[PDB]
Write a protein that binds this ligand. Sequence first.
Ligand SMILES: O=C(O)Cc1c[nH]c2ccccc12
Ligand SMILES: O=C(O)Cc1c[nH]c2ccccc12
Ligand SMILES: O=C(O)Cc1c[nH]c2ccccc12
Ligand SMILES: O=C(O)Cc1c[nH]c2ccccc12
Lengths: 101, 101
Amino acid sequence: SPYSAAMAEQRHQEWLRFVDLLKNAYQNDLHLPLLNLMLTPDEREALGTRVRIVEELLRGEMSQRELKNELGAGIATITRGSNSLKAAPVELRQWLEEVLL
Amino acid sequence: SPYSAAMAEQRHQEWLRFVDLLKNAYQNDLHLPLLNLMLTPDEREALGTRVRIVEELLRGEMSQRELKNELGAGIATITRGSNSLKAAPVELRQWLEEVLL
Ligand SMILES: O=C(O)Cc1c[nH]c2ccccc12
Ligand SMILES: O=C(O)Cc1c[nH]c2ccccc12
Ligand SMILES: O=C(O)Cc1c[nH]c2ccccc12
Ligand SMILES: O=C(O)Cc1c[nH]c2ccccc12
């Protein structure tokens, strides 16, 4: 039932509605309270850390435990971050290199 | 310790860095791939469902228990979202009542 095409369609519509809602929140300077409402504290903390992981993966200068050192992320978390960056369209990846480095 | 002054300060700045990175992604129409990179599929699904919860709570036409029957979220999740809505600043609440309802 969660795995039906109907639920897949509903999930994507709901995601796109959120995406569109946050787009307009940025336009109206309400993005910060909106992200406080819609995300828990540990999710905000995780998003801030994930930015630093992507930056350091793209810079390519640190190993496992130093990334585990200054960020406290396990080897599994960094691997999944690495997987996700490998899948990213390179328009996104090249822009991230420009702004994060 | 995660519960120190320096770690709190860094947690705040890392979160605001993500918020600004995403603001720039919207401006460049890279928000969808950035959000596919930075969030897991289940976090994206949760955010879609949380928009629906906030909508129905503000609407006030759906009982908190029949919210679970429609959306799948446990009463504990409905309650936490209601807690976050009660803590939201009024200007956000007023804006959501325009755009969600
Ligand atoms: O340290 C704090 O002020 C509380 C807190 C917990 N998780 C957070 C994520 C982002 C910003 C603040 C917090
Ligand atoms: O957070 C996870 O466990 C997976 C993950 C998704 N995007 C990431 C970006 C950087 C590091 C980890 C992840
Ligand atoms: O509350 C504060 O700002 C003081 C403080 C909390 N944890 C600390 C760890 C090391 C040095 C100072 C603090
Ligand atoms: O998802 C959670 O458990 C917490 C939560 C944060 N914002 C929410 C909005 C609606 C429903 C739940 C939440």
